[PDB]
Backbone:
């Protein structure tokens, strides 16, 4: 019962989103190709992602569940249960789709908050003799990212940090397959915006046949 | 005067914060050395950092102005005001000190929100024929970061993304000088903790004599 998690990190504004257009093309084609697959959406601007406070983690990837947990308010226990829920939904899926805009060489803050919620020891990684090892050894992931300028080549490619960070987390979680699909340069060459968008949508449709 | 911004990204009620300990030691010595200098604090867990709404920008770094501003919602007009306040405060300063914990190879989400607030065209960068170029050519920066693991050498150094990102942003804003001051390993060596903290505190008082 292949399950796919469509994770969007985009506010619900008037301005047209290139990343959400490519994402929509990808995910609509994917379901037409794979009608039996379950696709679950997590819209990070609609869902509540808890803030990390002193109380929710006892250390790196260690959800509070000891004597300090029992000393928590029902509010703080509810926060720990929500992080548990976010993480469980993440580990339960076979495939991950991230959709994001490039903001100041990275992604919206709430995608970091989401990563912080699902990075849990015994769930996405474990502590070994040789250090942290990922558990998600049979998953695959895709990032659909829109960028105003060109980041796939030239001096700018070294400044990209959003896809680069997601690549580091997927490595850390031991995800063996991480695809990038980029719609870029439409703010640098607005005369070519519709051609750039159409080309990325076609690429998205192609990837939806093999993902 | 010389104006120093002390920017902290740490949840409150942590009665064992390594980054804030070293931060304390660096800034307390700095004020004693330089009692004439104005030090302004921005605690990102006290102040409100607006959520980006793409509708308040006309392009990367460009806050809506004139008719574009006049057609906004009341909430949107207030956000532009707050972003312009945060950006003005950042530009006003001669020196920047960032204090953060390493969370999942990066920093708390609110520090991304703060960068998104101060990356403004005409203030921290400008466009030219070649695209964006930094405006902050006169200024100096330091990152005080706590890591529960070693990231200054080995294969792990290549997974570190929080200091690496701040380094890209300082470079983008044209800040010619960016130092890191790290407290690392106290989690890999719980008994060495009190020792590692004192070494870093030492190094902090040291740098505060010259910065
Ligand atoms: C807050 C903000 C930050 C941005 N930062 C960048 C940037 O770092 N580099 C760039 O080339 N374009 C930047 N842009 C332009 C966007 O990457 C571009 O508009 C992209 O299409 C955003 O994705 P979306 O269309 O899905 O919203 C920025 C835009 C905004 C609103
Ligand atoms: C949410 C969270 C994420 C963390 N992620 C990492 C990590 O990626 N690598 C690491 O070596 N330690 C990690 N740690 C351990 C912290 O970096 C370590 O506790 C550090 O001292 C935090 O700074 P502070 O002491 O000022 O709170 C993490 C801890 C927390 C609570």
Residues:
């Amino acid at each position: 019962m292949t399950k796919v998690l469509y994770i969007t990190a985009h506010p619900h504004d008037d301005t047209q989103s290139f990343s959400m257009a490519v994402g929509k093309a990808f995910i609509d084609t994917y379901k037409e190709v794979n009608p039996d697959h379950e696709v679950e959406t997590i819209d990070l601007y609609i869902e509540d992602i808890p803030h990390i406070d002193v109380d929710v983690f006892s250390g790196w990837g260690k959800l509070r569940s000891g004597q300090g947990f029992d000393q928590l308010s029902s509010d703080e226990k509810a926060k720990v249960g929500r992080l548990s829920e976010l993480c469980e939904q993440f580990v339960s899926a076979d495939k991950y789709i991230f959709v994001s805009p490039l903001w100041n060489f990275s992604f919206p803050p709430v995608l970091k908050a989401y990563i912080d919620s699902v990075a849990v020891a015994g769930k996405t990684f474990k502590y070994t003799e040789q250090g942290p090892v990922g558990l998600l050894t049979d998953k695959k992931a895709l990032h659909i990212q829109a960028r105003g300028g060109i980041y796939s080549e030239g001096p700018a490619a070294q400044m990209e940090m959003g896809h680069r960070y997601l690549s580091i987390i997927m490595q850390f979680f031991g995800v063996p397959s991480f695809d990038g699909l980029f719609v870029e340069g439409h703010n640098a060459m607005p005369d070519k915006a519709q051609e750039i968008k159409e080309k990325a949508v076609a690429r998205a449709k192609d990837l939806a046949h093999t993902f």
Notes: The first strand of chain B starts at residue 3 and ends at 8.
